[PDB]
Every structure is written in structure tokens, then in C-alpha cells.
RNA sequence: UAGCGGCGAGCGACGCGGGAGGAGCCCGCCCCGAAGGCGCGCUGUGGGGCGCACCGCCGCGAGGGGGCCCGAGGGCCCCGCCCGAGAGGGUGCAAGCCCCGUACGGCGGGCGGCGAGUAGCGCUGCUUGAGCGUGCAGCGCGAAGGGAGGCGCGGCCCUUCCAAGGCUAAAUACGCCCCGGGACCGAUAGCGGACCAAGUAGCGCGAGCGAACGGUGAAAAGGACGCCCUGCGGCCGCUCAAAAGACCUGAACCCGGCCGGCCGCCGGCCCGCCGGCCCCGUCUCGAAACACGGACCGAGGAGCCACGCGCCGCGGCGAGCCCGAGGGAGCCCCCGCGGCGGAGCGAGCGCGAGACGCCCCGGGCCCGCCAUGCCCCUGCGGGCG
RNA sequence: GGCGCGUGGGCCCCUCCUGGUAAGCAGGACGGGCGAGGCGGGACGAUCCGGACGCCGGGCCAGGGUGCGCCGCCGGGGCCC
RNA sequence: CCGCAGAGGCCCCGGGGGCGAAGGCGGCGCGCAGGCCCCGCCGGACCGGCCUCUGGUGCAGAUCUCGGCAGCAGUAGCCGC
RNA sequence: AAACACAGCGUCGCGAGGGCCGCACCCGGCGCUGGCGCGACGUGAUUUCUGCCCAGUGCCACGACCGUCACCGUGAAGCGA
RNA sequence: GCAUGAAUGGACCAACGAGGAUCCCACUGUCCCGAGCCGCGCCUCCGCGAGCCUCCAGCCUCGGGAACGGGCGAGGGCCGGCCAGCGGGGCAAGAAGACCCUUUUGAGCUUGACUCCAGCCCGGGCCUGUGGGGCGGG
RNA sequence: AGGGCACAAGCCCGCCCGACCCGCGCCCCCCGUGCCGGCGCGGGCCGCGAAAGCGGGGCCUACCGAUCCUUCGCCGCCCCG
């Protein structure tokens, strides 16, 4: 008696004719080398400007990644007003601007205003009157301009008496009451009308 | 490697282990899973109960990050505290400097009640608790809290 | 084209090839079909016996 | 993995997350009105929002003799030199130092205003995972604030965006042709096609079909002279290390001469006597069969690879584990998320495990689903059984 | 206990049966054999009588036989186209 | 376990070779065997024992494919005009 | 060939805005035609004849609209489907 | 009258027919019953020179055996090599039986098989104007 | 068709609807799968009888049917801003 789990793989399509549906990866090392060469050439062409732009810090979407940050597309106009800059100037000094995005809370605005202030503190501009030597002395930045770092959680301390004042002495009853409130009201309403049938007939 | 395979040890024998009376033909029973209720009914009934038919209601698009719900048992709580702080907190069974643990920061939503706890007060913040989890926590001197 | 209908010619020899297997020694003491009132009383008498009760403390 | 599916066989997306790359804008409508691209154009040219605030080219390029013996040594013995060059190819036999190359260079390149036979709806056809409709289309009807939120209809909210006009680099794909490489084939193989003439010779009214054929030697040195012969040819010798003489080597089947024997295989023997022996492969209850295939010889000739599932063995780590894509100029070095495991059951709202044990089996308890009794707070909610 | 292959046309003997005038016919049953079992014998045979097998030397002997082919025999009692 | 083709190593002054490699023909020896080794003649430039790795890896058959070729046989036949 | 054709015999449809056929569409043939015509069928020179059946199936009614038989349209109910 | 019959035409019929059938005259190797002859081939020679087929081989009788042997058991015969003829054997050769059956293998044709499509007929709407009138239901 | 049955399992009379609700196990056929059929139980509610008792139909061995779809019934859950 054969006892197996059934396969869930689709039959192949277009094997001897039609479009080519097979992808090989023999060019992986060559693609690596080519991408690096392109990056190096482009960096040489714009020295000493960094390859990347400064981009905002945003929260990851759903409830599953709620408490962490990543890199976003561009800063909103409210943040720029917080630092007193225009979209033209921001794009001039290497800042990404996204007028499609809207802030949903003040904590995001504060975080990104602080980010902009740091970047402006760390940025230097060269005039067309600067001699060629001091331009040669500049260092070209690598990678992401200022990476987003998520710290690991720590353990704090509190008072048992203070915490005992913030919850009822039967918390499970409290939680189960809030979960069932909508369905318990539906039963009550249907029961009251069922009583109106008792009196309406007499 | 082909040197060590069983097929290479059948050269000189004529039918290669498939028999004389039967032989090796193409598809003597059909292709795939065909015949499940007909000539393969015995096989399907012995090993695959609940293969045919429908059952339950259907959702046209499941929202995958709404149904997500990780849980932690009350006996894994103290492992979230590093060892040095661990011995420090255990030594002083303080009621004014009790450790505070927020399991949501570690990636959990609900606290269940399998296992036991060390005898020492502690504060635990979560979004939901089980009935027994709260009972065991309060018998060791701790208090549960709800965190945004 | 007719073929044979039935034979038991070789079946007794095949049965004895590895001996006649006896049942397991746990099939004799199963509770599979015993009277429920008897089974319930047996459970409660054991639990209240201090010398054979598995209740903790 | 939601779903579609004689709910059978089968089929099947997207979001969130991690990377490569990164760039934004215009027209109409509205204001001015020929200021314009002036033989055009007012049936609208031209200009504007109005108030608050890596490729190619060129070059140079080191270092060995003596003896023995061979048709010729790159061979054998002895003793040396060069090295940013001991990748290779050629040369009369295995060459860093006999020749060309290889390593090391240089040059050039507040106001105004947002798109109609349209969107949508009814009926019908195709299409999709899209399920009382995923996208499109025909016909009929046809608008003002409008669209969407993976089950329809009516009502009230919230969250989000503005169709029926237009432009845009990068990260991605890929044959011919050119360059480089290979645990690939080695002349019945490899492309049909290694051959001064292949899509050729040849076949078909035509659309089309389509072969076979590689190799003397270091050097053509490609065969002196002489003697027979009516000529055709023959002998003898010549070149060469060798005829290797239209050519490397030259097997099997089949055959001619000379020389020895008299019927196949196995066994015994002082060798032709004695004894034994049906034709293999195959389907079949059963083959020596008047069952089929097989004249003979050579070469070729048939369970490999990819993905999925189950179980077994071994290695590393272990409540954890993990060369993902990719990034660092290191095929082998460094960094590098999901995922799977860690808790189950339940159609679902959801609820959620400790009590025993070297191991195994079995009992006993605990969690979820179903049904009940008692108690009580915050109550079709909690607790105990 | 786990994983897995082949097989799923059978036939014959002994004794016991059913249909059929019968059949080297068709269909069943306990045990054995051939299939898949070499060797000696039954003149000759897949199955009968003995005996179930590595390569050899020696001995004993089952079944069946002992005029000659062709290894191996006599004695006694009875019958005899 | 024997054998075939190829890859990475070893082969005590750096494995065997025009003082003659591969291949062919004939003959001993070794091994239960698949096979291996040596000797003589031919030939004229390459070859491989052991350890690890890899596979388009072993033929008597397929009315098998391609090539060569026998008996039949000095046979049938070389009769229209 | 006893098969097919044949002259002859008979039936059926159509007066052009029609009939029969082609044809994806646009458009065509009979038709440079008009009932002494065109198209569709059966029997098969001459002579002599060709009986009965309209229950079945088929065809036909400028027969009839009895019952049934669509979308559309319109009436009632409904928050709307 | 198994089971004739009237344009699915009945009956009859002169002329005609490489049509099917019976008889008579004449004629004859069709025959009784075969004989003789002519030319070409065959046959022998010089020149030239193939195909098919082929497990191996090639004498019989009986037995047993896949129930009709060249080979096996038991008997009987036979130097070896060739020619002209011949048609008893070699279950002679020529072809994966066309008859019969099976396969969840086809195709041609038919229809009152089952599921449908062109075509045609019929109704309403759009194309689609400008006037008058009748009837039946609000 | 074969078994069974005598103050009865037959016949007559009286009252009734156990020809019920919830949940398990076993037997037969058998791969120890399904289906039909039967039997043994734990609870609820009932009938008859003075009571003990018996009753999940016609004394026993035959009298019948999956997935998908439709329809009906109790109590609840979902339509995912
Ligand atoms: K057969
Ligand atoms: K035959
Ligand atoms: K006619
Ligand atoms: K009629
Ligand atoms: K005729
Ligand atoms: Mg073979
Ligand atoms: Mg099979
Ligand atoms: Mg076979
Ligand atoms: Mg059978
Ligand atoms: Mg040089
Ligand atoms: Mg060289
Ligand atoms: Mg717009
Ligand atoms: Mg489709
Ligand atoms: Mg919704
Ligand atoms: Mg582009
Ligand atoms: Mg070739
Ligand atoms: Mg011999
Ligand atoms: Mg002999
Ligand atoms: Mg076969
Ligand atoms: Mg067969
Ligand atoms: Mg047979
Ligand atoms: Mg055989
Ligand atoms: Mg070969
Ligand atoms: Mg079979
Ligand atoms: Mg028989
Ligand atoms: Mg067999
Ligand atoms: Mg046996
Ligand atoms: Mg003797
Ligand atoms: Mg040479
Ligand atoms: Mg190969
Ligand atoms: Mg061969
Ligand atoms: Mg001749
Ligand atoms: Mg009649
Ligand atoms: Mg008539
Ligand atoms: Mg007639
Ligand atoms: Mg023969
Ligand atoms: Mg013989
Ligand atoms: Mg003849
Ligand atoms: Mg003959
Ligand atoms: Mg056949
Ligand atoms: Mg055939
Ligand atoms: Mg069948
Ligand atoms: Mg068909
Ligand atoms: Mg009574
Ligand atoms: Mg009861
Ligand atoms: Na060759
Ligand atoms: Na050579
Ligand atoms: Na035999
Ligand atoms: Na056959
Ligand atoms: Na043959
Ligand atoms: Na246990
Ligand atoms: Na024998
Ligand atoms: Na050799
Ligand atoms: Na091969
Ligand atoms: Na006529
Ligand atoms: Na046909
Ligand atoms: Na039954």
C-alpha cells in the first residue's frame, strides 16, 4: 500500500515549440561584474556627489510589521516647510521629494524633520570659484545616505502597585465582554421584538 | 553518480527487473490521479479520507496580515530577559522595581498559559490573554496590562 | 474465452508460512465495549484511594 | 494559496516583506488677442493662472654548451644561464634558453477651471482565479459632481482617489555577425554539410526532397640504367631509414598456391577408439517442433536528465536553522530577508494545553469541538463540575 | 515495525464428487508434485518409481533389473499354446 | 567486484617511450569467473599502475541501421521484326 | 451486361416586387431568358391497358383562429433587486 | 401463387444484340486412339553473364512427443562426385490472414440515436419624415 | 422455503401509538472498507399492567442506494472599512 501526499505541480507548457519558458542563470557572475562596472562609471561621472539621494523614514504597512521602519520614496511638503526649504532647492542639493504622500500623524513629521536637519548639518556645497585641488580632496559617499536602524527591545522596570490601578481585577471577563458586545446586542433586539408579538396579539 | 545505481547491475538480464509475463508498458493504469472513484477506490478510501466533496464557507480574498496572530506561553516569558538581568531580577523579588515585559515588542499578540512561572513579581503587557494565563500570573504576584 | 472461477488449492500452505499470528496481549483488557456504569465506578474508586490515586497532593 | 472546476481530471493570481534602478511633466478648458512659424491664421497663431502670501592604434621584447648515438633529436650522460617572460604554436624524434610569441609600455578616444453618444445600465457573444461578472465588444437607452473599498439589493456614514486627452531615461530580453572559453564530439560521431566546387551532384509538372567522399613522405627526392617484347607489357635493379609506389596502420567474413590431416562439442587415454550430447532467442500449463525471428562478418544500437512526493542512511548545527535575490572589485573569501520549526482544534464567531514515565505498549488526567447541572462579578459574560 | 518488487491465463497425481452416452471434455475438495528440481530407472515422455544438486578420491547400497545387443545369477517347489 | 572514456593527485634526484608507444597476429602463465600479464613477429609516436571524481560506459537476436561479401554458378538467360 | 442513356408518356413549382441555385462579405448563374419558357422528379419505342384504399406517414389550404405557444409592451404589489 | 400483378407499370411484340438458354442439318483429332512431319527454343561449343532463397543439414519404418520428425528411442539401408529430365516431399517461395473474435482503435453511409450549426420563415425595435381618421381600454 | 410456538408467538376483548428524541458500540458480508439488515447499551419522554415486567413495528432468516445539485426542518454563525 502506497501512502503518499499528492503532488501539486503543474504540467509543463511549450516544451518543443512556442515561447521559450526556461531561464538559465549561467550569466550570474558576468551580470554582477557588469552592474559593478556601470556603478563605478556613473560615480566617476558626478564626483563628488553621492550616487544615492536622501530619502525619508517610513513605517512598514500592515499590522505584522507595525513597529519597524524602512526607507521611503520622498519627503512631503510639510517636512520641507518644517526645515524651510522648497522642492526646487531640495532637489538641487540631492533630496528626494514626494508630493503624493501625506502625513498621517505628527510623529512621522517630527522623525523626518529631524532626519532633514541632520542631513543639512552634514552637507557641504562647492562654488564655481573653488580651486580644483580642494575639489579633489572631497570624499564620495558610498551606499545609502543614512541607513534606517531598528534597535532591539530592552527591559525596563515598574511598580506593581501603580500597575494594579490600571486594570480591573477580572481582566478576562472585561476582555470577553468587549469581544461579544455586538453579537449580544443583536440577540437582545431580536428578543425584545419577539416579545412585542406577545402583546400585539393581545 | 551512475556508477553506484541499481540499473547498471541489470545489464545482461533481458527485461531489467520488470518481469516477463507483465513487462514494462506505457500507462497500464492511466495518467495522474484518474480513477479515484472507480478502479482506484480501495486506495483512495484506505489512505485519503475527505478527498472528495465540499466543506465550509468560502472567502473570495483572504487578507493574510489580518489573520496573523502569534502567541507566547507563560513559560517562555523569562527567556526574553538576558541572563545578567535575569539573575539580578530573580535575586531581589522587588515589588517596586519589578521587570516590565512588552511581548508586542518581541512579535507576539496573545499570551497563553502552558507551563509555570518563577516565584517573583513581574508586569506583562500584551493585547490579549487567556483565562488561565491571567490566573497563573496573579498567583505569582504579577499583573497583566493592555498595550496599544 | 472462459478462465477459472475459484480455487483454494494453495491457501492453507500460504497461511502457515509464517505461523498463525496470535492477537496482541492488550486486546484482552480493552474497555472497548464494557458497561458504562461499571467503568465510571472503577474510575472514581481509584481516584479516591490514597494508595493508588494519581491526583497531585 | 485565496479561488475556479462533469467541485472530476486538472487549472491558479495579487498585496505586505527583501533587492536592482530611480525623474518628472504637458495640452484642453480660463485670461490677453496677431504681440505668431506672417502667401498661413480670428472656425484662433503666440504668451500667460488671478487674488493672499572601457574601445581602438602603435611598438620593443632575455637566456646553452660538450660527448654518445640516430635518416633527422626536442633522445641519453655531464655542466650551465634567464625570469615582471616555465600561456602556447613551429621546427626532420619529449625544446624556458633554435624561431614566433608570453611578462613588463605609449598614444588617441479667496477666485476661476478640470476631457459626452462618453461613464453607466438592459440583452447577447468571447475572455479571466475573479466566484448574482475579471476585461473587452455589438445593439438599445443614456448623466452631473463622480469612482473604488474581492456576495447581491435599498438606506446612512467613514477611508481614499479624479476616468472618458498626451510625452518620458534607467534597471530587463535577444538570432544572424565578431571575439574568448570548455571534466563536450573525434570522420556510421559532431551541424545535412572537416574533402580548392554542399543546400552541391541527383530526384520530382510543382510545392518540395537531398547524398557520398579526411590521412604518401622529413623532403616529390613521384621511380636511373640494362635486358627481352610485332606492341601491350615483363624481369633486373634505382630514390628512400622504409616503398610508405597513389599511397599511414590494414582486423573479420570469403578466397588461390604449397605443406600436413579426415569429419562438431564434452570426458579418458601412449590420438582414433569407447561413452555422453535435438537449435538457439521468445510468448506459453507445455517447444527439437510441421509455432515465429535468425545466410555470413564488421561497426553502431535501448531506464539518462529536470521537477514534485514518501521513506531510509550519513554530515553540520540545535529551540532553532538557512552559499535567497543582491552587495563588497577574490569561481572556492566576507555580509546577506522571507521561509520552515516552535500549539492545537474548530464550518465559523473563536477558544487554547502539565499529572504521572530509561525506552516501547497501555491506563490516567488536560485543550478544542457537542450536550448538560450548580454558583456569580463587568452578564446569551465569568467560574466550578 | 518501516519501505518496496514480482504475481493476479496455471496444469498434473492420489482419494472424494457434479453435469454429460462418453471424452487426452467441462466444473469443485484435503495432501503432494511440475511450473521453478539436476541424477538412476520406467525402451521412448515437464508430472510415474527412487532420490532433491559446491569440486574431488574411496566404500555402502534405493528403485529397477541380471540369454546377447548392454553393466549384472544361481539354487529349490508348482504350472505351462 | 571485473572492464571502457575522461577529470584532480602520487609515481625519492622525479613514472615508461625511435635501444621502438598505441594497434594487429600467434603462443605460454595467472584467476571459480568477468579478465589480466609476459614472449615472438608486424607497426611507427605516444602511453598509464594506485587514490578520489564523473558518464552518451560492456550486444547474438529487434521482418534492427549502414557497409562489405558467399553458396547457388560458369548456372538462368542473350526466341518479335 | 439484363446495368446507364434514349425518343415518348406523366406529375409538380413559378407571371419578375418571381422561382431555383451559388456565395465569408461585397456580389453572382439560369438570363443576349418570359409559360410552344425555365427548373424539379418518376416511368422508359410501338400495340392494348392502367382496378380498389386518404385509416398510417408525407404534402397542401387567399381554411379557421378553438387550445397552446416568445421577446417586446402594458397593469397591480414592492425599499429595491 | 412459402412470397405474381398493373407508370415501385401489367400483358404482348416485328426489327436489332461480341446478351442468357434448348434442339436439328452440315462439319470436323472434341473423342474412340493416337501416328507422322516442319520451323524456333531446349541440348553441345566460343564469347558474355544475373535474381529469388538460405538456423544447421539434407535416406526410410514404427514409437513417444505441442496428439502427422531430418535430428530423440528401436530397427532397416547407403563409397565419393556429376548430367539430362521430373514435379512425391522439404507442413517449398511470394504478404506481420482480407474470413472469425477482441481492443473502452477508426473511417464511409443511414435515420423517428443525442448534442448542435448554416439557411430560411415569423414578430418587435432602430433606420424614419409630414398630415388625417376609426375602434377598444382610462 | 426452511425453522419456531399451547393457561402461547394462535383466537377474542380492553386501553394505547416504543411504527418516539439525543449519543455510542458490536455482529453478518469482509481487504476485517462501504451499503442493506440485526443486536447491546447510556440518557429524555411515554404506553399497558395490581405488580414483577415488557415495548426503537408485523416470530426468525429477503423486501433496497455515494460525491455534486435541489428542497425542507431546529438553533446559531459569516457577508472581511
Ligand atoms: K502461443
Ligand atoms: K504459421
Ligand atoms: K424522360
Ligand atoms: K392523410
Ligand atoms: K450485347
Ligand atoms: Mg539477449
Ligand atoms: Mg504490469
Ligand atoms: Mg515483454
Ligand atoms: Mg481469474
Ligand atoms: Mg625573443
Ligand atoms: Mg615548444
Ligand atoms: Mg481629467
Ligand atoms: Mg476559459
Ligand atoms: Mg466589503
Ligand atoms: Mg527604456
Ligand atoms: Mg557527418
Ligand atoms: Mg576429445
Ligand atoms: Mg558417440
Ligand atoms: Mg517477447
Ligand atoms: Mg500475449
Ligand atoms: Mg497454446
Ligand atoms: Mg524453445
Ligand atoms: Mg558495438
Ligand atoms: Mg495476464
Ligand atoms: Mg484439460
Ligand atoms: Mg511462467
Ligand atoms: Mg518442487
Ligand atoms: Mg555383460
Ligand atoms: Mg615519425
Ligand atoms: Mg562521452
Ligand atoms: Mg552484431
Ligand atoms: Mg545457357
Ligand atoms: Mg406481393
Ligand atoms: Mg395504380
Ligand atoms: Mg414487382
Ligand atoms: Mg524438418
Ligand atoms: Mg537416433
Ligand atoms: Mg517443372
Ligand atoms: Mg514438390
Ligand atoms: Mg496477424
Ligand atoms: Mg494484416
Ligand atoms: Mg475491456
Ligand atoms: Mg467515427
Ligand atoms: Mg396470554
Ligand atoms: Mg430507557
Ligand atoms: Na578510421
Ligand atoms: Na604518421
Ligand atoms: Na523437450
Ligand atoms: Na507471432
Ligand atoms: Na527467415
Ligand atoms: Na506515554
Ligand atoms: Na530422469
Ligand atoms: Na601490443
Ligand atoms: Na547509449
Ligand atoms: Na423529350
Ligand atoms: Na472510408
Ligand atoms: Na439484509
Closest residue in B to A3 (Cα) is: B47
CA dist A174 and A77 (Å) reads 44
Q: How far is CA B3 from the centre of its chain?
A: 41
Measure Cα distances from B74 to A19, A52, B51 in Å: 57, 46, 38
Distance CA B38, CA B30 (A): 12
Which one, of B102, B112, B116, B81, lies nearest residue B146 by Cα? B102
| Count of beta carbons in the 10 Å neighbourhood of residue A94 | 14
CA/C1' separation B52–D347 (Å)? 17
Provide the number of CB pairs (under 8 Å) joining chain A to chain B: 70
B60 Cα to chain A: minimum distance (Å):
20
Candidates B148, C20, B5; CA nearest to A166 is B148
Chain B contact set for A165 (CB, 8 A):
none
CA→C1' distance for A202 and I73 (Å): 29
The C-alpha atoms of residue A76 and residue A73 are separated, in whole angstroms, by 10
Q: Under a CB-based contact definition with an 8 Å cutoff, are residues A75 and A96 in contact? A: yes
Report the C-alpha gap between B74 and A53 in whole angstroms.
Answer: 46
CA distance B101 to A157: 9
Interface of A with B in 45-104 (CB under 8 A): 62-64, 67
Concatenated DSSP letters for A73-119?
S-B-HHHHHHTT--HHHHHHTTB-B-TT----SHHHHHHHHHHHHHH
Minimum-distance CB partner of A167 among B98, B101, B143? B143
Task: Select the residue of B121, B129, B146 nearest A160 (Cβ to Cβ).
Answer: B121
Cell of B121: 513579581
Query: Taking a C-beta distance cutoff of 8 angstroms, is the pair A96, A53 a contact?
Result: yes
* Cα–Cα distance, B118 to A121 (Å, whole number): 51
Determine the residue of chain A that is closest to B108 in CA distance: A64
What is the per-residue DSSP string for B3-47?
Answer: GG-GGGGGTTSSSTTSTTTT---S-TT-STTTTTTTTTHHHHHHH
Resolution of the determined structure in angstroms stands at 2.5
Say if CB B101 and CB B122 are below 8 A apart: yes
- Phi, psi values for residue C27, rounded to 5°: -70, -20
Neighbours of B35 (CB within 10 A): 14
> B83 preceded by cis ω (within 30°)?
no
For A6: left if phi > 0, alpha if psi spans -120 to 50, otherwise beta; the answer is beta
Distance B110 CA to ligand 10 centre (A): 82
Residue reference for cell 510589521: A65
CA B97 to each of CA B40, B120, B123, B137: distance values in angstroms, whole numbers, following the listed order: 69, 11, 10, 17
Per the CB < 8 A criterion, the answer to whether B103 and B123 are in contact is no
Strand partners, B145: B125
Work out whether strand B98-102 and strand B128-129 pair parallel, antiparallel, or are unpaired.
unpaired
Cβ of C32 less than 7 A from strand E: no
Cell representation of residue A166:
490600571
Q: Is the CB of A113 under 7 A from strand D?
A: no
Q: Which of A171, C33, A82, A2 is nearest to B42 (CA)?
A: A2
Q: Which residue has the cell 538559465?
A: A24
> 3-class secondary structure for A17-83?
CCCCCCCCCCCHHHHHHHHHHHHHHHHHHCCCCCCCCECCEEECCCHHHCCCEEECCCECHHHHHHC
Task: For the beta carbon of residue A56, count every other beta carbon within 10 angstroms.
Answer: 24
The phi, psi pair for C15, rounded to 5°, reads -65, -40
Q: Chain-centre distance of CA C19, in angstroms?
A: 19
Test A160 with B142 for CB contact under 8 angstroms: yes
Tell me the C-alpha distance between B71 and B111, whole Å. Answer: 6
According to the entry, how was the structure determined? cryo-EM
What own/partner pairs with CB < 8 Å and gap ≥ 24 does B37-45 have?
B43/A1, B43/A2
CA of A167 relative to ligand 32 center, distance in Å: 130
Mark yes or no for CB contact A1/B106 under 8 Å. Answer: no
Q: List the end-to-end C-alpha distance of chain A, in Å, as a whole number.
A: 71
Helices A171-179/B131-138 angle, 10° precision:
160
| B71/B47 Cα distance (integer angstroms) | 33
Amino acid at each position: 500500500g502506497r501512502n503518499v501526499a499528492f503532488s501539486n505541480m503543474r504540467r509543463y507548457k511549450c516544451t518543443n515549440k512556442g515561447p521559450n519558458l526556461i531561464k538559465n542563470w549561467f550569466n550570474q557572475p558576468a551580470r554582477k561584474i557588469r552592474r559593478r562596472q556601470t556603478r563605478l562609471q556613473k560615480a566617476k561621472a558626478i564626483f563628488p556627489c553621492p550616487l544615492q539621494k536622501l530619502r525619508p523614514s517610513v513605517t512598514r504597512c500592515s499590522q505584522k510589521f507595525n513597529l519597524t521602519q524602512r526607507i521611503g520614496r520622498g519627503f512631503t511638503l510639510r517636512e520641507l516647510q518644517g526645515v524651510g526649504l522648497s522642492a526646487g532647492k531640495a532637489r538641487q542639493i540631492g533630496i528626494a521629494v514626494d508630493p503624493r504622500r501625506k502625513n498621517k500623524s505628527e510623529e512621522s513629521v517630527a522623525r523626518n524633520v529631524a532626519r532633514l536637519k541632520e542631513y543639512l548639518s552634514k552637507v557641504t556645497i562647492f562654488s564655481k570659484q573653488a580651486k580644483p585641488e580642494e575639489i579633489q580632496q572631497a570624499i564620495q559617499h558610498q551606499g545609502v545616505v543614512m541607513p534606517v536602524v531598528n534597535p532591539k527591545p530592552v527591559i525596563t522596570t515598574g511598580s506593581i502597585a501603580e500597575a494594579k490601578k490600571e486594570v480591573p481585577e477580572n481582566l478576562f471577563m472585561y476582555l470577553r465582554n468587549a469581544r461579544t458586545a455586538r453579537n449580544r446586542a443583536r440577540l437582545a433586539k431580536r428578543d425584545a421584538e419577539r416579545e412585542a408579538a406577545a402583546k400585539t396579539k393581545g | 553518480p551512475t556508477r553506484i545505481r541499481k540499473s547498471r547491475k541489470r545489464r545482461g538480464h533481458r527485461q531489467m527487473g520488470y518481469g516477463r509475463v507483465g513487462g514494462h508498458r506505457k500507462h497500464p493504469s492511466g495518467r495522474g490521479k484518474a480513477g479515484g472513484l472507480q478502479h482506484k477506490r480501495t486506495s483512495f478510501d484506505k489512505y485519503h479520507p475527505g478527498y472528495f466533496g465540499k466543506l465550509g464557507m468560502r472567502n473570495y480574498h483572504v487578507r493574510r496580515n489580518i489573520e496573523y496572530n502569534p502567541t507566547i506561553n507563560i513559560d517562555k516569558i523569562w527567556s526574553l530577559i538576558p541572563e545578567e538581568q535575569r539573575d539580578g531580577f530573580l535575586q531581589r523579588k522587588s515589588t517596586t522595581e519589578a521587570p516590565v515585559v512588552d511581548v508586542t515588542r518581541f512579535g507576539f499578540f496573545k499570551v497563553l498559559g502552558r507551563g509555570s512561572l518563577p516565584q517573583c513579581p513581574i508586569i506583562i503587557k500584551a493585547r490579549y490573554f487567556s483565562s488561565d494565563a491571567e490566573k497563573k500570573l496573579r498567583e505569582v504576584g504579577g499583573v497583566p496590562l493592555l498595550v496599544p | 474465452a472462459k478462465l477459472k472461477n475459484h480455487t483454494s488449492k494453495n491457501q492453507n500452505r500460504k497461511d502457515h508460512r509464517n505461523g498463525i499470528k496470535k492477537p496482541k496481549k492488550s486486546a484482552y483488557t480493552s474497555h472497548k465495549g464494557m458497561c458504562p456504569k461499571y467503568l465510571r465506578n472503577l474510575r472514581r474508586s481509584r481516584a479516591n484511594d490514597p494508595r493508588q490515586s494519581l491526583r497531585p497532593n
